[PDB]
Amino acid sequence: SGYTPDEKLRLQQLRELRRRWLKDQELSPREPVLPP
């Protein structure tokens, strides 16, 4: 069988969104925690 192309395109939009979110989930100001 295989993918219907709708699933391919929808899956690619979730690839772009998931990779941008997971790249955002790094904290890096190179000053991550700080005492008040």
Partner 1 sequence: GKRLFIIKPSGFYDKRFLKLLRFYILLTGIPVVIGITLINVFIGEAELAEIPEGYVPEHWEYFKHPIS
Q: Quick one: 27 or 34, whose CB is closer to partner 1? A: 27
Instruction: List C-alpha distances in Å: 33 to 22, 23, 24.
Output: 20, 19, 17
Q: How far is the CB of 15 from partner 1 (least distance, A)?
A: 20
> Could you list the residues that contact partner 1 (CB under 8 A)?
25-28, 32
Nearest-approach distance from CB 22 to partner 1, in angstroms: 9
Whole-number Cα distances in Å, 19 to 1, 3, 12, 26, 27: 28, 21, 11, 12, 15
- Residue whose CB is less far from partner 1, 2 or 36: 36
